[PDB]
């Protein structure tokens, strides 16, 4: 109900709205500049692959 999830190519621009909250002009992965939309801050996400934190450890 919060909006459909899509991958982001990049953040094109930023602004503050009338309510003093941050909005982000998003370039959507697979779409051009015409399809760029202003999204509220809480709509942005960082995704990560599941990792085995032990593989990363360095021995000597």
């Amino acid at each position: 109900a919060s909006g459909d999830l899509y991958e982001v190519e990049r953040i094109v621009d930023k602004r503050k709205n009338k309510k003093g909250k941050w909005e982000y002009l998003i370039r959507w992965k697979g779409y051009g500049s015409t399809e760029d939309t202003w999204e509220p801050e809480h709509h942005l996400l960082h995704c990560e692959e599941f990792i085995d934190e032990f593989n990363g450890l360095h021995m000597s």
């Binding site: 999830l5 899509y6 202003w38 999204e39 996400l45 960082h46």
Partner: peptide, 14 residues
């Protein structure tokens, strides 16, 4: 490297 993603507003503000 972390993927960038976001929820799209419907209707949209261009």
């Amino acid at each position: 490297l972390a993927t960038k993603a976001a929820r799209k507003s419907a209707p949209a503000t261009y």
